[PDB]
Amino acid sequence: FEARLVQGSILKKVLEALKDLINEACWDISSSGVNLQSMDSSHVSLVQLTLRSEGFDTYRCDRNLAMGVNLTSMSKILKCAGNEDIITLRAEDNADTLALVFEAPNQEKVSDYEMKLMDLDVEQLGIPEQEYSCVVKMPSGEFARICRDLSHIGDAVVISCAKDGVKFSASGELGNGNIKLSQTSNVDKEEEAVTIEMNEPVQLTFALRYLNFFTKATPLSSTVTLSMSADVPLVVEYKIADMGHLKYYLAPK
Amino acid sequence: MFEARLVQGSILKKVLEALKDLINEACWDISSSGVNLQSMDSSHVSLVQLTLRSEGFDTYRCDRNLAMGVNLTSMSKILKCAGNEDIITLRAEDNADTLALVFEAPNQEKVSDYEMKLMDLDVEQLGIPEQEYSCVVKMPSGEFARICRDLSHIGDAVVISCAKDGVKFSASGELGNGNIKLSQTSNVDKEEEAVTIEMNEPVQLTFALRYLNFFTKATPLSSTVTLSMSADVPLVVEYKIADMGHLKYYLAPK
Amino acid sequence: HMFEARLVQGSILKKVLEALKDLINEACWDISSSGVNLQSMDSSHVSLVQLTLRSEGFDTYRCDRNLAMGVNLTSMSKILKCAGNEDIITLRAEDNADTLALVFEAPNQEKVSDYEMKLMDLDVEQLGIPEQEYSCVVKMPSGEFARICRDLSHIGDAVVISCAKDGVKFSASGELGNGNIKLSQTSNVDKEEEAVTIEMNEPVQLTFALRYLNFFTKATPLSSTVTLSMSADVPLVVEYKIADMGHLKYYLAPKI
Amino acid sequence: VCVRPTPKWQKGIGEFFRL
Amino acid sequence: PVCVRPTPKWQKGIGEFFRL
DNA sequence: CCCATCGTAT
DNA sequence: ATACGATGGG
């Protein structure tokens, strides 16, 4: 398996997003590309990364490998990589090893790191096809700020999806707080827009702890898509360029 | 009733950073004239007096005179939510234990509104008088900020000596001794960067650097500070707030 | 009577003392007509540092006799941190006080700090430094070298510098895995300043503790270039030059 | 951000998904 | 991010190389 | 060269 | 749980 990524800063961004939520996880390499799917320490939330081979330069995969990586380990190694560096994954089928090679732009420095793989009992989970009562698309940043701000009011947030806009509310010791995101009538902020596909109205409750973890992915995308129905796991999705996506799953009240 | 619409919301935010390390809870005094606040520090060492004149707000309406008991640490955490470019509005009803802070972003798109629980505070408002002052230094807020930080590393008290020529600040301890001499500005194109002295009598007072360093958390409100001093009398550090009012600290010399 | 040394570019005195303070608690400055010298071992007696600021580099330099000032560098650092980076710093001492005066004139010309620090009595001991030919001598960007030592500090606790004709390689290992950084020699690109140059006589493959290298790199602000200089079982010399004023040289013994 | 805890009333993702 | 790694056992001091 | 973000120690 | 210094961006 060999995979040359021009924009190396992605593999770096990905691993910051994940490492607060997952210690160790199984990368599933195939001709089609790189997939990953894990639950959190606490078995509360679920993350699924999907990076399609189309998005790499060199992509070659002979057999389907299932590499057990320690994400905290792999992050510390990836933090070495320059953000403008051309990153390449190489792994030799046999061996408990994954090679990350980093070429800098001057073409005159080249790092290469070998990290020790793990054997992982990957409890394979099966994420159903669902239609969704509501689906907000909004700026990753905006959503990030809301979750940070309301984390100061209380420990749960109440997302109310409606025809004309979305509301987020939280309460506690200090008081109460309501944040009302109206819909963008298109052609403004430039992309910095809020769009809604509301079939059935919803008011769901979620713990802000986990939302605030999921938002660590914010660097990957200027847009986040929240997708909801009564007592069915909310799906926070960050799309990765033209290459894949990252999806979080959290069960509501 | 009371509603007060502030276009430049970053001021209400700056105010509350300046206060929150010095005062836990305090009584806001709302009136037709505007917003006044006056508290001592937890430790009964210093006093702060905030004055925001109604003229400085956009909308200001205040029926009768309310005395709102706010927890400043609480109100800060809520104001930290507000974007710095956001249009902040205070609303509070008569007979009521709550103050509403509404924050509209510039995009016109996002709008926060927070409700905080008020408390009952008896506070026997001091009464500060006009006083004449042996010395009055007017200098850059930054300069003064730096001096207090630097000397805080030498020890825990600073010695402000006012003279005709200039002002001097000295402190001593473990490391050694340090003297910082601010001469008066000869040219001074700009206020931002000038040192001015109004010396009547010479003075040498001693103050705790702990409290000075608290007072300097107000530095964002103004490019200028004014220190004002007399032989047996609380120092007054004063930060003026753009078209709105002022913030004044009072510290009694050691 | 008196020593006085006026440095227009004050940020140097500041930079020097950041470079030294993680390595040395207390040391004897050797002040003389010729200039300011310092030569100390570290707390643990592992490495050696030799600072040399030549009088020609100061604006005012006057030294009436030789002083040997015992300074507490922790103290002197905290005092120098007060000085603005654009400040005109002046070091002044009489033969008849136990004290060193650091006076700071800000660039605005209306503010002036002056600090008085107490000197100390230091039973020193000055090491003899022998003339030495060097199997290898890398000259590279201070930054590059800084990054390498930081990065590999995350792999483990020693780094293996292999010098060859073609280029230099740095390798380290530990719990997580293994790590190799190959720095090939520069033909050019922009223009000196950001080049890798090698003076290889004999190939060398030496092992060094990353703890100490990472201390030495705290000097990086003084120079855009560093020079590593190496031989079988002979202390490595990391050297930062200070703008036609002097230099700072660290000495660390390799694995044997 | 203020350090949060996980509400007692949280369900596991196990009750929603499986193999 | 910089790791301050302990001082290797195999470290020699500069004392054994230079003297008064 | 000043302002904005990060990380630990009390 | 809150303060105060350390690091990086513009």
Side-chain angles (χ1 to χ4, degrees), chain A residues 1 3-5 8-10 13-15 17-19 22-23 25-28 30-31 33-37 39-40 43-44 46-47 50 52-57 59 61-62 64-69 71-73 75 77-78 80-82 86-89 91 95 97-105 110 112-115 117 119-120 125-126 128 132 134-135 138-144 146-147 149-162 164-166 168 170 172 175 177 193 196 198 201 204-220 228 230 233 235-238 240-249 251-252, chain B residues 1-2 4-6 9-11 13-26 28-31 33-38 40 44 46-52 56-57 59-62 65 67-69 71-76 78-79 81-83 85-86 88-90 92 96 98 100 103 105-106 111-112 114 116 119 121 127-129 131-135 138-145 147-148 150-151 153-160 162-163 166-171 173-185 194-198 202-216 218-231 233-239 241-253, chain C residues 1-7 9-12 14-55 57-58 60-63 65-66 68-73 75-77 79-80 82-85 87-90 92-93 97 99-108 111-138 140-143 145-160 162-164 166-174 177 179-181 184 195-200 202-217 219-222 224-237 239-256, chain D residues 2 5-10 12-14 16-17, chain E residues 1-4 6-8 10-11 13-18:
Chain A
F1 159 55
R4 151 90 99 250
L5 193 51
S9 48
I10 285 184
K13 272 176 195 150
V14 162
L15 255 104
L18 295 160
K19 68 168 195 289
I22 331 284
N23 263 274
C26 178
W27 298 66
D28 299 333
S30 103
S31 22
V34 188
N35 233 255
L36 174 139
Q37 193 183 51
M39 274 153 67
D40 85 358
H43 281 238
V44 167
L46 174 90
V47 55
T50 299
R52 304 180 299 282
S53 71
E54 306 96 66
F56 292 92
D57 286 47
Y59 197 90
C61 192
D62 302 351
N64 292 350
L65 292 156
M67 294 177 348
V69 177
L71 298 185
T72 344
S73 288
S75 188
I77 294 161
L78 272 162
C80 291
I86 305 278
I87 300 169
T88 336
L89 309 175
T97 348
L98 156 67
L100 298 101
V101 187
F102 312 144
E103 314 164 52
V110 179
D112 86 288
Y113 302 90
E114 280 192 275
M115 61 169 293
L117 295 195
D119 314 54
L120 278 181
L125 211 67
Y132 280 120
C134 218
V135 183
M138 72 188 278
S140 45
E142 220 85 58
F143 176 66
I146 290 156
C147 297
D149 290 359
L150 296 191
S151 89
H152 299 156
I153 316 311
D155 65 32
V157 66
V158 165
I159 315 194
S160 27
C161 223
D164 59 22
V166 52
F168 306 88
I196 290 153
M198 215 231 59
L204 295 171
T205 289
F206 305 100
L208 274 162
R209 185 170 143 81
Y210 284 93
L211 284 182
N212 274 307
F213 288 137
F214 300 173
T215 49
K216 289 201 192 301
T218 285
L220 296 164
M228 285 167 288
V235 181
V236 175
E237 187 197 30
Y238 300 89
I240 312 193
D242 44 29
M243 178 167 311
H245 63 236
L246 182 58
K247 271 195 165 105
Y248 303 92
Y249 292 94
Chain B
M1 177 55 24
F2 158 56
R5 190 165 125 102
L6 194 52
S10 48
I11 287 172
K13 287 186 68 199
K14 272 175 198 149
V15 164
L16 252 104
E17 286 286 304
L19 297 160
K20 66 166 215 286
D21 288 355
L22 212 72
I23 331 284
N24 268 275
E25 47 190 46
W28 297 65
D29 295 4
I30 321 272
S31 101
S33 43
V35 185
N36 191 100
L37 176 137
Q38 191 182 320
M40 272 163 78
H44 282 219
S46 78
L47 174 90
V48 54
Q49 192 253 327
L50 170 74
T51 290
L52 294 161
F57 287 72
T59 313
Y60 197 93
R61 280 176 211 16
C62 182
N65 294 342
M68 306 189 329
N71 167 17
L72 302 188
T73 27
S74 286
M75 180 181 174
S76 188
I78 290 165
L79 269 160
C81 293
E85 319 301 359
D86 279 24
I88 300 165
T89 336
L90 308 180
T98 262
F103 317 140
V111 176
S112 347
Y114 303 89
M116 183 183 102
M119 33 172 326
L121 293 168
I128 294 77
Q131 158 57 190
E132 294 176 45
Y133 279 119
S134 297
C135 216
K138 198 181 184 294
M139 72 165 94
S141 44
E143 216 157 353
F144 179 64
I147 291 158
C148 297
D150 290 356
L151 295 190
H153 299 140
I154 315 312
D156 62 32
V158 65
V159 162
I160 316 195
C162 227
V167 51
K168 186 193 67 172
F169 306 88
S170 302
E174 272 287 62
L175 295 175
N177 310 311
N179 314 269
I180 291 172
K181 214 148 280 175
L182 275 171
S183 64
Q184 181 160 358
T185 10
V195 169
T196 312
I197 290 147
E198 315 77 275
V203 287
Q204 162 164 326
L205 297 169
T206 288
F207 303 101
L209 274 163
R210 197 179 170 90
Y211 289 88
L212 282 180
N213 272 309
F214 288 136
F215 300 174
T216 49
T219 285
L221 297 162
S222 194
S223 53
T224 71
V225 72
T226 252
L227 319 170
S228 344
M229 287 171 285
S230 275
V233 152
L235 161 74
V236 319
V237 181
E238 188 182 8
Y239 298 90
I241 316 191
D243 325 21
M244 268 225 69
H246 63 236
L247 185 56
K248 272 182 168 99
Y249 303 93
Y250 290 94
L251 183 67
Chain C
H1 262 117
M2 188 199 259
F3 159 57
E4 185 164 52
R6 189 171 170 270
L7 194 52
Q9 288 178 349
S11 48
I12 287 183
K14 292 187 73 189
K15 272 176 205 136
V16 164
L17 251 105
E18 286 289 315
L20 299 160
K21 67 159 218 300
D22 282 13
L23 214 66
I24 332 166
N25 296 176
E26 304 189 306
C28 224
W29 297 67
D30 289 23
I31 296 166
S32 101
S33 332
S34 325
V36 182
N37 259 21
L38 178 138
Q39 192 213 262
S40 180
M41 278 148 85
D42 67 48
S43 310
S44 330
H45 286 202
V46 159
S47 70
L48 175 89
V49 53
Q50 147 101 50
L51 171 77
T52 287
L53 293 163
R54 303 182 304 279
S55 69
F58 288 75
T60 308
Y61 196 88
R62 184 203 186 180
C63 196
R65 316 304 225 95
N66 291 346
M69 288 191 325
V71 179
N72 175 323
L73 302 188
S75 284
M76 182 170 165
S77 194
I79 291 163
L80 271 160
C82 288
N85 313 255
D87 279 23
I88 309 261
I89 301 162
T90 335
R92 209 209 298 89
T99 263
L100 163 69
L102 294 99
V103 186
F104 308 149
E105 313 171 41
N108 62 44
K111 189 215 190 97
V112 180
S113 341
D114 87 69
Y115 304 87
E116 281 69 55
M117 176 177 49
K118 234 70 193 45
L119 295 190
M120 288 193 182
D121 214 16
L122 302 174
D123 274 308
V124 103
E125 44 137 10
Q126 290 289 314
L127 297 198
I129 293 167
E131 187 81 320
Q132 188 81 60
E133 278 278 59
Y134 279 119
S135 290
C136 263
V137 184
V138 197
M140 72 168 87
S142 45
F145 179 65
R147 190 113 168 71
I148 293 156
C149 297
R150 179 173 90 245
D151 289 1
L152 296 191
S153 89
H154 292 110
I155 315 313
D157 74 23
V159 65
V160 171
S162 324
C163 224
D166 66 283
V168 51
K169 185 193 78 165
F170 303 90
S171 34
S173 44
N180 314 270
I181 292 167
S184 61
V196 170
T197 314
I198 288 147
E199 239 100 67
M200 214 220 66
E202 199 155 0
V204 284
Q205 162 162 342
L206 291 173
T207 292
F208 302 106
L210 271 165
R211 182 165 156 80
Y212 288 93
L213 285 177
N214 272 308
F215 293 142
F216 302 174
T217 49
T220 285
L222 298 161
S224 49
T225 71
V226 69
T227 250
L228 321 171
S229 349
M230 282 173 287
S231 292
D233 325 356
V234 144
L236 159 77
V237 188
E239 191 185 0
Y240 300 87
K241 65 99 167 64
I242 316 193
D244 64 5
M245 181 166 302
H247 65 64
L248 184 54
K249 287 173 136 110
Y250 305 92
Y251 290 97
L252 175 72
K255 194 166 159 298
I256 306 197
Chain D
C2 207
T6 299
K8 35 207 193 65
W9 59 255
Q10 194 54 282
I13 249 191
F16 287 79
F17 301 155
Chain E
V2 197
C3 221
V4 184
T7 304
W10 57 261
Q11 190 56 62
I14 193 69
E16 309 165 29
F17 292 77
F18 303 147

